[PDB]
Write a protein that binds this ligand. Sequence first.
Ligand SMILES: CC[C@@H](Oc1cccc(CN(CCCOc2ccc(OC)cc2)c2nc3ccccc3o2)c1)C(=O)O
Length: 262
Amino acid sequence: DLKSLAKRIYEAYLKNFNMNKVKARVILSGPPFVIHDMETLCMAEKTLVAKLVANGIQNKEAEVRIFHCCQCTSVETVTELTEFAKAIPGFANLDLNDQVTLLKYGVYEAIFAMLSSVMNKDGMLVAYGNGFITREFLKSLRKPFCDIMEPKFDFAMKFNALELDDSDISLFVAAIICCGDRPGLLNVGHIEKMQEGIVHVLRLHLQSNHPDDIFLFPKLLQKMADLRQLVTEHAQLVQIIKKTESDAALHPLLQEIYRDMY
Ligand SMILES: CC[C@@H](Oc1cccc(CN(CCCOc2ccc(OC)cc2)c2nc3ccccc3o2)c1)C(=O)O
């Protein structure tokens, strides 16, 4: 039954996420338009996000346009994660408020975990796999926008070195969502039992799928803690940008996620 549960989780991930590691690797293997400088950013925008640059002199600064594009992907991924969570045994049986709380704290940890699948050491896929933005270009942006993506590349290079596949990532994302220590949960006991169940599925799956790496489960527990810290730091940077960059608006769904988070 635990093998069946692992497969159900994987099937739910394949249905619900537009991007996965298989799809990303096909693309990254060599088509995506390469964004490596301001000229190619602007060319890519004209083809792939035309509306955002159809304002002439009224267009926002390039860094702010990138900030906006990043948030759009997060909004869509939050929708995918909310539908995915229904496949987790017990999740749909929880009080609606607890569902909201688990998603509030888990979505960005899951986002940064899955973001790793579209990253290599030189850059990352964007716009549903139709662009590839270089790591060096993102580092070249004016402060503080150059500080957004680099810590996520750093996380991703080490996470990708574990050589997880989608079957593993689906269970890891389910485990992220099930954390029983999120602030403000009502039914901690039922959430802890839901978490115990999914973590048991994850541990057995990693044992079967990665017999060569006897420590992969505790490695991933540590990655979960690393992701929590990465999200805490990211939220702090987002708040700095919101307060100091008059054009860098935050989408209302994301402002609700960030509100009172850390
Ligand atoms: C800034 C505040 C914002 O921070 C971030 C920080 C890091 C990553 C994201 C979301 N993200 C990057 C999208 C870039 O999207 C474009 C699109 C077009 C473009 O130029 C034409 C440039 C960038 C992403 N990709 C994914 C791929 C797979 C799985 C999950 C994914 O998550 C948001 C937040 O907090 O929401």
